[PDB]
């Protein structure tokens, strides 16, 4: 189109291999990071325990519950408990799930992420649904129990980003590479005999012209074209984990102007 262009190589529901071209490494990275850390998302963040007889101790379970991915499509229309005006929390800032399990089965009964039960009005919006990608559709085996083992607790998912704690990160691994044929000389291969021989070529050597002796050293040579691959956990559609990345970062760079403004009044 106009500035930094893209060209999606393969693409699925969980990854988005693609070529970010004609950008600044700084920027490629800035985004890279923003994806991992500052994208809003929802997750369980408070666990009230009424009853537990499992073998796993309270907080043990509680810990896990925070990692069980949750729905976050419309997260951008749910407020941060801290900014909402309720004495603590409301449907306007949070989702509430439930979990009650009993060892009825004569053989090890299973508690799964699917057993969660939203109880707050989802005010009509995609949010708080125990994301499942499991084959049988039970996803995340929370825990197991024996005979008369019971487990009753309540959850309260709120907004929050990865910097506050990882359980809010949506990203989870991101492939980042550039200049497969060390042309900018941004590295110096260690070797016993031959660099080229001992150090594997990357699947990206293709998409870029090989070096070829003779030629002098391209020093004015900068670095555009980055072979990234943004995976996802689900809470958000792999595409989003890149758009919202792109956006979030944008807003930050934004606020800095806005700041320079109020600061201009005096």
């Amino acid at each position: 189109e106009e500035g930094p262009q893209v060209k999606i190589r393969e693409a699925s529901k969980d990854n988005v291999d693609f070529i970010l071209s004609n950008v600044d490494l700084a920027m490629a990275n800035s985004l890279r990071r923003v994806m991992i850390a500052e994208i809003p998302t929802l997750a369980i963040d408070s666990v009230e325990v009424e009853t537990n007889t499992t073998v796993l101790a309270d907080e043990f379970i509680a810990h896990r519950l925070g990692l069980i991915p949750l729905q976050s499509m419309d997260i951008e229309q749910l407020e941060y408990s801290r900014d909402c005006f309720c004495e603590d929390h409301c449907d306007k800032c949070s989702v509430v799930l439930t979990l009650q399990a009993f060892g009825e089965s004569e053989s090890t009964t299973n508690v799964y992420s699917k057993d969660l039960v939203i109880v707050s009005n989802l005010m009509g919006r995609n949010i708080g649904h125990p994301i499942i990608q499991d084959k049988e559709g039970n996803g995340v085996l929370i825990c197991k129990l024996r005979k008369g083992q019971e487990l009753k607790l309540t959850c309260v998912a709120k907004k929050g980003i990865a910097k506050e704690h990882a359980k809010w990160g949506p990203a989870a691994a991101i492939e980042f590479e550039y200049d497969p044929w060390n042309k900018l000389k941004h590295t110096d291969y260690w070797y016993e005999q031959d660099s080229a021989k001992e150090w594997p070529q990357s699947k990206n050597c293709e998409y870029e012209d090989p070096p070829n002796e003779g030629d002098p050293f391209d020093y004015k040579a900068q670095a555009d074209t980055f072979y990234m691959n943004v995976e996802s956990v689900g809470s958000i559609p792999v595409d989003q984990v890149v758009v919202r990345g792109i956006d979030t970062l944008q807003k930050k760079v934004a606020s800095i102007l806005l700041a320079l403004t109020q600061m201009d009044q005096d």
Binding site: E2, A11, A26, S30, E38, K163, I246, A259
Partner: protein, 115 residues
């Protein structure tokens, strides 16, 4: 125990401003801006861009010490050109480039098939 609160990494504490600009006395026409509750993500980028305005004589930034979410940015510019502005532009540019990158990523995406 002596652990700082996780959110302090991004929530401006009672009475702090993202920016704070102090005029570097060492050299002429150059300043030092302190970015509170921010890090490399933002910094490195505003430093890069800032490094194009050919009217910008100097630009660099550093994170004081890991423990603290914040960084100082020193920008020095050609006479009659005030750096505050230089920062402004470099900011906008980044936004504009990102916006493009967005439309464009969306373009390619819409024109795809999942499996």
């Amino acid at each position: 125990m002596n652990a700082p609160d996780r959110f302090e990494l991004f929530l401006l504490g009672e009475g702090e401003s993202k920016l704070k600009i102090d005029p570097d006395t060492k050299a002429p026409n150059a300043v030092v801006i302190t970015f509170e509750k921010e890090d490399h993500t933002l910094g490195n980028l505003i430093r890069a861009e800032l490094l194009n305005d050919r009217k910008v004589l100097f630009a660099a930034y550093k994170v004081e010490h890991p423990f603290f979410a914040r960084f100082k940015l020193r920008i020095q510019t050609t006479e009659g050109y005030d750096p505050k502005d230089a920062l402004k532009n470099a900011c906008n540019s980044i936004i504009n480039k990102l916006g493009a990158l967005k439309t464009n990523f969306e373009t390619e995406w819409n024109l795809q098939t999942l499996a």
